[PDB]
Each structure stands twice: as structure tokens, then as C-alpha cells.
């Protein structure tokens, strides 16, 4: 079966969030993690893997701590060359117990055996108040891609083109992204929980299942509702 669509009042209302939408915007803006063919260099917790990635900024490397929902996932990818992609956070990010040290969840896929000679296009149908007035595609060269990478790619587009997230707030009241693949479907709430503060780590933690979808069979739909 599939996951049931958002019940009424289930989705977070951006107007119920009184902090700065900026703290959410920063999760889907230009900044994020994208590393190709890297292998964990260290580990803090049993369920995380630490990587050293080349920084496009300047001749230098960054540190990214990747946390999974369990140790088995970490054990599976340690010692493996993987591609890492995801929304990272710095604020409460620790590597033991800095613009170059960040933390994230999941976003890991084995490199060898998962590459595609060419790029695949995944369509995104955006519904604003129930009407599909905008449709764009995202591309990937990974046979198995994490929902997180596709989620980021989609939201990043909506941020740069539809102002999904703005410094102060959002032009949309609620919003969720739904991934459809064969007999399964699931969605994430795109808006921050109610309150005056937004916990980026807690929010991004939803990606720690390292959930993946087949790039050739996945379909994406984003449902946004504007503010009256």
C-alpha cells in the first residue's frame, strides 16, 4: 500500500510558525552537501559516518557528519565509496563528545553500480491550491536516488522561482512534497513545525532513513496552498 495523504489540519501552517523562515530557506538554498565517490574517514556515534569532501569554495576540504536512523546503515556504508547529497545544518552540529563543519542525515548512495551513463528526468507537478499551474523537472544520474536529494532539488527550484521560502516567511500557508513510485507513495511536510523557533536538525532528521527511490520510476508532486 501507500502512505495516506495529509489529513485536514495535519500539515504545518507557515502562519503558525513565528520564527524566521530564513532558517528553513537556508536548508534548500545554494548551500548543501554534494560529494562524489568518497569514503567515510571517521566516525563519532555508531550510527554516523564522517566524510572529508573537496570544497568548491577554494582549494580545501570540508567535514560532513552523516547520521542514519540506525547503526546497520552506518555499517553498510562505512568502507564503501559513496555519493553523498543532502541538506546540511551547522548550528547544533557536533563531531565529538565553523563554515567547514556540518551535519546531515542520510543522503548516501553507493557509487559503483549506481551510476547512469546519461541523465534521467523526473517530473515535478506543483499544485497551488489544487491547480497544476507549474511543472518542471529535476535530473539525476543515479539509478537509486535518495528522496532527500530529489526533495532538495525540487525545493531549491521552488525557492529560486516561486519564493517557496523567504527571509521572513512563505507566500504559501501549507506545503508537502509527495514521491510516487509503483505501489508506494509518501510525503514530507515542507513547512516548519508551529512555534517561534525552528529546529533544523530535528526537521532534517526525517532523512535519516536514507530512503531511496528508483530514478526511472519516481514521480513527484508538490501541493502548495496560498494565504488568503
Amino acid at each position: 500500500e501507500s502512505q495516506p495523504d495529509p489529513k485536514p489540519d495535519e500539515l504545518h501552517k507557515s502562519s503558525k510558525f513565528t520564527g524566521l523562515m530564513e532558517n528553513m530557506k537556508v536548508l534548500y538554498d545554494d548551500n548543501h552537501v554534494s560529494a562524489i565517490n568518497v569514503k567515510s574517514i571517521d566516525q563519532f556515534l555508531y550510527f554516523d559516518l564522517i566524510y572529508s569532501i573537496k570544497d568548491t569554495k577554494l582549494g580545501n576540504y570540508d567535514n560532513v557528519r552523516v547520521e542514519f536512523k540506525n547503526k546497520d546503515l552506518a555499517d553498510k556504508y562505512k568502507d564503501k565509496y559513496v555519493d553523498v547529497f543532502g541538506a546540511n545544518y551547522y548550528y547544533q552540529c557536533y563531531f565529538s563528545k565553523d563554515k567547514r563543519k556540518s551535519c546531515m542525515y542520510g543522503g548516501v548512495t553507493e557509487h559503483n553500480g549506481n551510476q547512469l551513463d546519461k541523465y534521467r528526468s523526473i517530473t515535478v507537478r506543483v499544485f497551488e491550491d489544487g491547480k497544476n499551474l507549474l511543472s518542471f523537472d529535476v535530473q539525476t544520474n543515479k539509478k537509486k536516488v535518495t528522496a532527500q536529494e530529489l526533495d532538495y532539488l525540487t525545493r531549491h527550484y521552488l525557492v529560486k522561482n516561486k519564493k517557496l521560502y523567504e527571509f521572513n516567511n512563505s507566500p504559501y500557508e501549507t506545503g508537502y512534497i509527495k514521491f510516487i513510485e509503483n505501489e508506494n507513495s509518501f510525503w514530507y511536510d515542507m513547512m516548519p513545525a508551529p512555534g517561534d523557533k525552528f529546529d533544523q536538525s530535528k526537521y532534517l532528521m526525517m532523512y535519516n532513513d536514507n530512503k531511496m527511490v528508483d530514478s526511472k520510476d519516481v514521480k513527484i508532486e508538490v501541493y502548495l496552498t496560498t494565504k488568503k
Side-chain angles (χ1 to χ4, degrees), residues 147-174:
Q148 177 182 187
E149 171 167 7
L150 295 179
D151 188 3
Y152 172 79
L153 289 183
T154 299
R155 305 206 199 173
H156 179 76
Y157 185 94
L158 290 181
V159 165
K160 306 298 179 174
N161 299 289
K162 300 298 299 176
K163 316 196 306 174
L164 172 54
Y165 300 127
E166 290 185 281
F167 191 87
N168 205 60
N169 44 68
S170 174
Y172 305 105
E173 189 58 278
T174 69

PDB file of all heavy atoms in Angstrom, residues 147-174:
ATOM      1  N   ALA A 147      15.341  10.179  -1.591  1.00  0.00           N
ATOM      2  CA  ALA A 147      14.218  11.092  -1.691  1.00  0.00           C
ATOM      3  C   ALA A 147      14.720  12.482  -1.280  1.00  0.00           C
ATOM      4  O   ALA A 147      14.225  13.502  -1.760  1.00  0.00           O
ATOM      5  CB  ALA A 147      13.097  10.631  -0.751  1.00  0.00           C
ATOM      6  N   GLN A 148      15.715  12.505  -0.395  1.00  0.00           N
ATOM      7  CA  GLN A 148      16.283  13.748   0.104  1.00  0.00           C
ATOM      8  C   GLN A 148      16.888  14.574  -1.023  1.00  0.00           C
ATOM      9  O   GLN A 148      16.596  15.760  -1.147  1.00  0.00           O
ATOM     10  CB  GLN A 148      17.350  13.465   1.171  1.00  0.00           C
ATOM     11  CG  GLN A 148      18.049  14.737   1.698  1.00  0.00           C
ATOM     12  CD  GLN A 148      19.138  14.463   2.728  1.00  0.00           C
ATOM     13  OE1 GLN A 148      19.685  15.396   3.320  1.00  0.00           O
ATOM     14  NE2 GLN A 148      19.459  13.184   2.947  1.00  0.00           N
ATOM     15  N   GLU A 149      17.733  13.959  -1.844  1.00  0.00           N
ATOM     16  CA  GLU A 149      18.346  14.682  -2.956  1.00  0.00           C
ATOM     17  C   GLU A 149      17.283  15.237  -3.898  1.00  0.00           C
ATOM     18  O   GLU A 149      17.397  16.366  -4.367  1.00  0.00           O
ATOM     19  CB  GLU A 149      19.292  13.778  -3.745  1.00  0.00           C
ATOM     20  CG  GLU A 149      19.786  14.412  -5.036  1.00  0.00           C
ATOM     21  CD  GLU A 149      20.942  13.660  -5.662  1.00  0.00           C
ATOM     22  OE1 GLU A 149      21.299  12.560  -5.185  1.00  0.00           O
ATOM     23  OE2 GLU A 149      21.499  14.179  -6.643  1.00  0.00           O
ATOM     24  N   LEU A 150      16.258  14.431  -4.180  1.00  0.00           N
ATOM     25  CA  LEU A 150      15.172  14.860  -5.059  1.00  0.00           C
ATOM     26  C   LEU A 150      14.346  15.944  -4.385  1.00  0.00           C
ATOM     27  O   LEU A 150      13.861  16.863  -5.045  1.00  0.00           O
ATOM     28  CB  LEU A 150      14.267  13.685  -5.408  1.00  0.00           C
ATOM     29  CG  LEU A 150      14.855  12.542  -6.233  1.00  0.00           C
ATOM     30  CD1 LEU A 150      13.776  11.482  -6.434  1.00  0.00           C
ATOM     31  CD2 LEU A 150      15.363  13.067  -7.572  1.00  0.00           C
ATOM     32  N   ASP A 151      14.182  15.822  -3.070  1.00  0.00           N
ATOM     33  CA  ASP A 151      13.435  16.791  -2.270  1.00  0.00           C
ATOM     34  C   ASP A 151      14.170  18.132  -2.339  1.00  0.00           C
ATOM     35  O   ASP A 151      13.582  19.159  -2.679  1.00  0.00           O
ATOM     36  CB  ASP A 151      13.353  16.297  -0.816  1.00  0.00           C
ATOM     37  CG  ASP A 151      12.438  17.145   0.045  1.00  0.00           C
ATOM     38  OD1 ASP A 151      11.826  18.087  -0.500  1.00  0.00           O
ATOM     39  OD2 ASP A 151      12.323  16.879   1.262  1.00  0.00           O
ATOM     40  N   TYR A 152      15.461  18.123  -2.027  1.00  0.00           N
ATOM     41  CA  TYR A 152      16.258  19.349  -2.068  1.00  0.00           C
ATOM     42  C   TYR A 152      16.198  20.011  -3.452  1.00  0.00           C
ATOM     43  O   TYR A 152      15.927  21.211  -3.565  1.00  0.00           O
ATOM     44  CB  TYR A 152      17.716  19.045  -1.712  1.00  0.00           C
ATOM     45  CG  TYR A 152      18.640  20.225  -1.910  1.00  0.00           C
ATOM     46  CD1 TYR A 152      18.712  21.252  -0.966  1.00  0.00           C
ATOM     47  CD2 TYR A 152      19.406  20.338  -3.066  1.00  0.00           C
ATOM     48  CE1 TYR A 152      19.523  22.362  -1.175  1.00  0.00           C
ATOM     49  CE2 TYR A 152      20.212  21.438  -3.281  1.00  0.00           C
ATOM     50  CZ  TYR A 152      20.268  22.446  -2.336  1.00  0.00           C
ATOM     51  OH  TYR A 152      21.070  23.539  -2.565  1.00  0.00           O
ATOM     52  N   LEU A 153      16.458  19.216  -4.493  1.00  0.00           N
ATOM     53  CA  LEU A 153      16.442  19.696  -5.873  1.00  0.00           C
ATOM     54  C   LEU A 153      15.133  20.388  -6.206  1.00  0.00           C
ATOM     55  O   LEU A 153      15.127  21.470  -6.798  1.00  0.00           O
ATOM     56  CB  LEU A 153      16.657  18.533  -6.845  1.00  0.00           C
ATOM     57  CG  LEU A 153      18.053  17.911  -6.889  1.00  0.00           C
ATOM     58  CD1 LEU A 153      18.097  16.836  -7.942  1.00  0.00           C
ATOM     59  CD2 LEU A 153      19.066  18.986  -7.200  1.00  0.00           C
ATOM     60  N   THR A 154      14.025  19.755  -5.823  1.00  0.00           N
ATOM     61  CA  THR A 154      12.690  20.301  -6.055  1.00  0.00           C
ATOM     62  C   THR A 154      12.449  21.613  -5.273  1.00  0.00           C
ATOM     63  O   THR A 154      12.011  22.620  -5.843  1.00  0.00           O
ATOM     64  CB  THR A 154      11.593  19.283  -5.636  1.00  0.00           C
ATOM     65  OG1 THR A 154      11.709  18.081  -6.416  1.00  0.00           O
ATOM     66  CG2 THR A 154      10.209  19.885  -5.827  1.00  0.00           C
ATOM     67  N   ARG A 155      12.727  21.594  -3.971  1.00  0.00           N
ATOM     68  CA  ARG A 155      12.502  22.773  -3.150  1.00  0.00           C
ATOM     69  C   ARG A 155      13.419  23.913  -3.533  1.00  0.00           C
ATOM     70  O   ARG A 155      13.021  25.071  -3.494  1.00  0.00           O
ATOM     71  CB  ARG A 155      12.690  22.461  -1.666  1.00  0.00           C
ATOM     72  CG  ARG A 155      11.844  21.318  -1.150  1.00  0.00           C
ATOM     73  CD  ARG A 155      11.604  21.470   0.335  1.00  0.00           C
ATOM     74  NE  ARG A 155      11.200  20.209   0.937  1.00  0.00           N
ATOM     75  CZ  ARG A 155      11.046  20.018   2.240  1.00  0.00           C
ATOM     76  NH1 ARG A 155      11.253  21.019   3.084  1.00  0.00           N
ATOM     77  NH2 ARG A 155      10.728  18.813   2.695  1.00  0.00           N
ATOM     78  N   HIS A 156      14.657  23.593  -3.886  1.00  0.00           N
ATOM     79  CA  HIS A 156      15.609  24.619  -4.284  1.00  0.00           C
ATOM     80  C   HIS A 156      15.039  25.409  -5.465  1.00  0.00           C
ATOM     81  O   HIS A 156      15.141  26.636  -5.516  1.00  0.00           O
ATOM     82  CB  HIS A 156      16.926  23.979  -4.702  1.00  0.00           C
ATOM     83  CG  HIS A 156      17.956  24.965  -5.146  1.00  0.00           C
ATOM     84  ND1 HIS A 156      18.664  25.752  -4.258  1.00  0.00           N
ATOM     85  CD2 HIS A 156      18.396  25.304  -6.379  1.00  0.00           C
ATOM     86  CE1 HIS A 156      19.498  26.523  -4.929  1.00  0.00           C
ATOM     87  NE2 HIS A 156      19.356  26.271  -6.218  1.00  0.00           N
ATOM     88  N   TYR A 157      14.452  24.678  -6.414  1.00  0.00           N
ATOM     89  CA  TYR A 157      13.845  25.262  -7.606  1.00  0.00           C
ATOM     90  C   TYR A 157      12.713  26.186  -7.190  1.00  0.00           C
ATOM     91  O   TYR A 157      12.637  27.341  -7.625  1.00  0.00           O
ATOM     92  CB  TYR A 157      13.275  24.165  -8.509  1.00  0.00           C
ATOM     93  CG  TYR A 157      12.733  24.662  -9.833  1.00  0.00           C
ATOM     94  CD1 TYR A 157      13.528  24.662 -10.977  1.00  0.00           C
ATOM     95  CD2 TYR A 157      11.428  25.156  -9.936  1.00  0.00           C
ATOM     96  CE1 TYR A 157      13.049  25.137 -12.186  1.00  0.00           C
ATOM     97  CE2 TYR A 157      10.938  25.639 -11.141  1.00  0.00           C
ATOM     98  CZ  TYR A 157      11.759  25.624 -12.263  1.00  0.00           C
ATOM     99  OH  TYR A 157      11.289  26.098 -13.468  1.00  0.00           O
ATOM    100  N   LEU A 158      11.827  25.659  -6.350  1.00  0.00           N
ATOM    101  CA  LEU A 158      10.681  26.421  -5.870  1.00  0.00           C
ATOM    102  C   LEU A 158      11.109  27.621  -5.046  1.00  0.00           C
ATOM    103  O   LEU A 158      10.385  28.598  -4.966  1.00  0.00           O
ATOM    104  CB  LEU A 158       9.748  25.523  -5.051  1.00  0.00           C
ATOM    105  CG  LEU A 158       8.961  24.437  -5.800  1.00  0.00           C
ATOM    106  CD1 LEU A 158       8.076  23.689  -4.819  1.00  0.00           C
ATOM    107  CD2 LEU A 158       8.107  25.064  -6.873  1.00  0.00           C
ATOM    108  N   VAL A 159      12.280  27.545  -4.427  1.00  0.00           N
ATOM    109  CA  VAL A 159      12.787  28.670  -3.646  1.00  0.00           C
ATOM    110  C   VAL A 159      13.268  29.773  -4.593  1.00  0.00           C
ATOM    111  O   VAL A 159      12.906  30.941  -4.448  1.00  0.00           O
ATOM    112  CB  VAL A 159      13.963  28.247  -2.733  1.00  0.00           C
ATOM    113  CG1 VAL A 159      14.711  29.468  -2.225  1.00  0.00           C
ATOM    114  CG2 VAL A 159      13.431  27.446  -1.557  1.00  0.00           C
ATOM    115  N   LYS A 160      14.069  29.392  -5.579  1.00  0.00           N
ATOM    116  CA  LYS A 160      14.593  30.355  -6.533  1.00  0.00           C
ATOM    117  C   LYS A 160      13.562  30.850  -7.543  1.00  0.00           C
ATOM    118  O   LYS A 160      13.731  31.928  -8.121  1.00  0.00           O
ATOM    119  CB  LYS A 160      15.777  29.752  -7.282  1.00  0.00           C
ATOM    120  CG  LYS A 160      16.859  29.208  -6.367  1.00  0.00           C
ATOM    121  CD  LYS A 160      17.473  30.303  -5.506  1.00  0.00           C
ATOM    122  CE  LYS A 160      18.540  29.743  -4.578  1.00  0.00           C
ATOM    123  NZ  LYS A 160      19.250  30.823  -3.848  1.00  0.00           N
ATOM    124  N   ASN A 161      12.494  30.089  -7.757  1.00  0.00           N
ATOM    125  CA  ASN A 161      11.499  30.501  -8.739  1.00  0.00           C
ATOM    126  C   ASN A 161      10.115  30.848  -8.207  1.00  0.00           C
ATOM    127  O   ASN A 161       9.403  31.635  -8.819  1.00  0.00           O
ATOM    128  CB  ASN A 161      11.383  29.430  -9.827  1.00  0.00           C
ATOM    129  CG  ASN A 161      12.691  29.221 -10.577  1.00  0.00           C
ATOM    130  OD1 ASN A 161      13.122  30.079 -11.349  1.00  0.00           O
ATOM    131  ND2 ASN A 161      13.334  28.085 -10.340  1.00  0.00           N
ATOM    132  N   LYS A 162       9.723  30.278  -7.075  1.00  0.00           N
ATOM    133  CA  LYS A 162       8.400  30.566  -6.532  1.00  0.00           C
ATOM    134  C   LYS A 162       8.463  31.149  -5.126  1.00  0.00           C
ATOM    135  O   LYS A 162       7.442  31.285  -4.455  1.00  0.00           O
ATOM    136  CB  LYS A 162       7.542  29.297  -6.520  1.00  0.00           C
ATOM    137  CG  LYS A 162       7.317  28.675  -7.896  1.00  0.00           C
ATOM    138  CD  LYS A 162       6.569  29.614  -8.824  1.00  0.00           C
ATOM    139  CE  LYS A 162       5.204  29.952  -8.266  1.00  0.00           C
ATOM    140  NZ  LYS A 162       4.475  30.943  -9.104  1.00  0.00           N
ATOM    141  N   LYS A 163       9.665  31.495  -4.685  1.00  0.00           N
ATOM    142  CA  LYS A 163       9.853  32.046  -3.353  1.00  0.00           C
ATOM    143  C   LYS A 163       9.234  31.141  -2.292  1.00  0.00           C
ATOM    144  O   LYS A 163       8.608  31.628  -1.348  1.00  0.00           O
ATOM    145  CB  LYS A 163       9.214  33.425  -3.264  1.00  0.00           C
ATOM    146  CG  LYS A 163       9.495  34.312  -4.457  1.00  0.00           C
ATOM    147  CD  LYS A 163       9.179  35.767  -4.130  1.00  0.00           C
ATOM    148  CE  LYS A 163       7.754  35.940  -3.614  1.00  0.00           C
ATOM    149  NZ  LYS A 163       7.512  37.346  -3.168  1.00  0.00           N
ATOM    150  N   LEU A 164       9.401  29.830  -2.455  1.00  0.00           N
ATOM    151  CA  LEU A 164       8.856  28.857  -1.507  1.00  0.00           C
ATOM    152  C   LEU A 164       9.170  29.286  -0.080  1.00  0.00           C
ATOM    153  O   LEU A 164       8.306  29.277   0.800  1.00  0.00           O
ATOM    154  CB  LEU A 164       9.462  27.473  -1.763  1.00  0.00           C
ATOM    155  CG  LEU A 164       9.125  26.389  -0.731  1.00  0.00           C
ATOM    156  CD1 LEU A 164       7.617  26.306  -0.570  1.00  0.00           C
ATOM    157  CD2 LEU A 164       9.691  25.038  -1.171  1.00  0.00           C
ATOM    158  N   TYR A 165      10.429  29.652   0.129  1.00  0.00           N
ATOM    159  CA  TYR A 165      10.909  30.105   1.426  1.00  0.00           C
ATOM    160  C   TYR A 165      11.547  31.463   1.220  1.00  0.00           C
ATOM    161  O   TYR A 165      12.342  31.652   0.296  1.00  0.00           O
ATOM    162  CB  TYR A 165      11.960  29.137   1.997  1.00  0.00           C
ATOM    163  CG  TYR A 165      11.452  27.727   2.197  1.00  0.00           C
ATOM    164  CD1 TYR A 165      12.134  26.639   1.658  1.00  0.00           C
ATOM    165  CD2 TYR A 165      10.264  27.482   2.893  1.00  0.00           C
ATOM    166  CE1 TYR A 165      11.650  25.337   1.792  1.00  0.00           C
ATOM    167  CE2 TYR A 165       9.765  26.177   3.040  1.00  0.00           C
ATOM    168  CZ  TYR A 165      10.466  25.110   2.484  1.00  0.00           C
ATOM    169  OH  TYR A 165       9.983  23.827   2.628  1.00  0.00           O
ATOM    170  N   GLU A 166      11.171  32.414   2.066  1.00  0.00           N
ATOM    171  CA  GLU A 166      11.731  33.753   2.002  1.00  0.00           C
ATOM    172  C   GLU A 166      12.371  34.057   3.355  1.00  0.00           C
ATOM    173  O   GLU A 166      12.260  33.271   4.299  1.00  0.00           O
ATOM    174  CB  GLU A 166      10.642  34.778   1.644  1.00  0.00           C
ATOM    175  CG  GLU A 166      10.152  34.645   0.194  1.00  0.00           C
ATOM    176  CD  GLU A 166       9.151  35.719  -0.219  1.00  0.00           C
ATOM    177  OE1 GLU A 166       7.960  35.607   0.142  1.00  0.00           O
ATOM    178  OE2 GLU A 166       9.564  36.679  -0.905  1.00  0.00           O
ATOM    179  N   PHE A 167      13.052  35.186   3.451  1.00  0.00           N
ATOM    180  CA  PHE A 167      13.712  35.526   4.695  1.00  0.00           C
ATOM    181  C   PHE A 167      12.770  35.514   5.896  1.00  0.00           C
ATOM    182  O   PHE A 167      13.045  34.867   6.908  1.00  0.00           O
ATOM    183  CB  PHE A 167      14.369  36.901   4.584  1.00  0.00           C
ATOM    184  CG  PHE A 167      15.281  37.223   5.729  1.00  0.00           C
ATOM    185  CD1 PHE A 167      16.616  36.838   5.696  1.00  0.00           C
ATOM    186  CD2 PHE A 167      14.794  37.864   6.868  1.00  0.00           C
ATOM    187  CE1 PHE A 167      17.456  37.082   6.778  1.00  0.00           C
ATOM    188  CE2 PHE A 167      15.634  38.111   7.962  1.00  0.00           C
ATOM    189  CZ  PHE A 167      16.966  37.718   7.913  1.00  0.00           C
ATOM    190  N   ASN A 168      11.649  36.217   5.774  1.00  0.00           N
ATOM    191  CA  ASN A 168      10.703  36.319   6.878  1.00  0.00           C
ATOM    192  C   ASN A 168       9.704  35.178   6.955  1.00  0.00           C
ATOM    193  O   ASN A 168       9.494  34.591   8.021  1.00  0.00           O
ATOM    194  CB  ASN A 168       9.963  37.653   6.800  1.00  0.00           C
ATOM    195  CG  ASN A 168       9.463  38.101   8.144  1.00  0.00           C
ATOM    196  OD1 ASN A 168      10.250  38.296   9.066  1.00  0.00           O
ATOM    197  ND2 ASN A 168       8.149  38.260   8.274  1.00  0.00           N
ATOM    198  N   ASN A 169       9.077  34.859   5.834  1.00  0.00           N
ATOM    199  CA  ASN A 169       8.128  33.764   5.827  1.00  0.00           C
ATOM    200  C   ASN A 169       7.936  33.135   4.445  1.00  0.00           C
ATOM    201  O   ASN A 169       8.855  33.113   3.618  1.00  0.00           O
ATOM    202  CB  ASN A 169       6.790  34.236   6.415  1.00  0.00           C
ATOM    203  CG  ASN A 169       6.361  35.597   5.887  1.00  0.00           C
ATOM    204  OD1 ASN A 169       6.036  35.745   4.709  1.00  0.00           O
ATOM    205  ND2 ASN A 169       6.360  36.601   6.765  1.00  0.00           N
ATOM    206  N   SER A 170       6.748  32.600   4.201  1.00  0.00           N
ATOM    207  CA  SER A 170       6.466  31.993   2.917  1.00  0.00           C
ATOM    208  C   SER A 170       5.152  32.516   2.370  1.00  0.00           C
ATOM    209  O   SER A 170       4.248  32.851   3.129  1.00  0.00           O
ATOM    210  CB  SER A 170       6.391  30.473   3.054  1.00  0.00           C
ATOM    211  OG  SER A 170       5.972  29.885   1.836  1.00  0.00           O
ATOM    212  N   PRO A 171       5.039  32.611   1.039  1.00  0.00           N
ATOM    213  CA  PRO A 171       3.815  33.091   0.392  1.00  0.00           C
ATOM    214  C   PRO A 171       2.768  31.982   0.389  1.00  0.00           C
ATOM    215  O   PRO A 171       1.643  32.176  -0.072  1.00  0.00           O
ATOM    216  CB  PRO A 171       4.290  33.443  -1.012  1.00  0.00           C
ATOM    217  CG  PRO A 171       5.333  32.413  -1.255  1.00  0.00           C
ATOM    218  CD  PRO A 171       6.109  32.423   0.045  1.00  0.00           C
ATOM    219  N   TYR A 172       3.156  30.821   0.913  1.00  0.00           N
ATOM    220  CA  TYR A 172       2.275  29.665   0.990  1.00  0.00           C
ATOM    221  C   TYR A 172       1.971  29.289   2.436  1.00  0.00           C
ATOM    222  O   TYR A 172       2.852  29.316   3.295  1.00  0.00           O
ATOM    223  CB  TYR A 172       2.908  28.477   0.267  1.00  0.00           C
ATOM    224  CG  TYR A 172       3.288  28.794  -1.161  1.00  0.00           C
ATOM    225  CD1 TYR A 172       4.621  29.006  -1.522  1.00  0.00           C
ATOM    226  CD2 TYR A 172       2.310  28.912  -2.150  1.00  0.00           C
ATOM    227  CE1 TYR A 172       4.967  29.325  -2.827  1.00  0.00           C
ATOM    228  CE2 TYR A 172       2.643  29.230  -3.455  1.00  0.00           C
ATOM    229  CZ  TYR A 172       3.968  29.435  -3.788  1.00  0.00           C
ATOM    230  OH  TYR A 172       4.296  29.744  -5.085  1.00  0.00           O
ATOM    231  N   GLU A 173       0.717  28.937   2.699  1.00  0.00           N
ATOM    232  CA  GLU A 173       0.296  28.563   4.039  1.00  0.00           C
ATOM    233  C   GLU A 173       0.796  27.172   4.400  1.00  0.00           C
ATOM    234  O   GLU A 173       1.406  26.976   5.442  1.00  0.00           O
ATOM    235  CB  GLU A 173      -1.228  28.611   4.139  1.00  0.00           C
ATOM    236  CG  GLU A 173      -1.746  28.455   5.550  1.00  0.00           C
ATOM    237  CD  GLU A 173      -1.210  29.517   6.484  1.00  0.00           C
ATOM    238  OE1 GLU A 173      -0.073  29.370   6.973  1.00  0.00           O
ATOM    239  OE2 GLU A 173      -1.914  30.520   6.724  1.00  0.00           O
ATOM    240  N   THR A 174       0.525  26.197   3.547  1.00  0.00           N
ATOM    241  CA  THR A 174       0.986  24.839   3.811  1.00  0.00           C
ATOM    242  C   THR A 174       1.624  24.288   2.555  1.00  0.00           C
ATOM    243  O   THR A 174       1.447  24.835   1.466  1.00  0.00           O
ATOM    244  CB  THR A 174      -0.162  23.872   4.216  1.00  0.00           C
ATOM    245  OG1 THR A 174      -1.014  23.648   3.090  1.00  0.00           O
ATOM    246  CG2 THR A 174      -0.972  24.437   5.376  1.00  0.00           C
TER     247      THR A 174
END
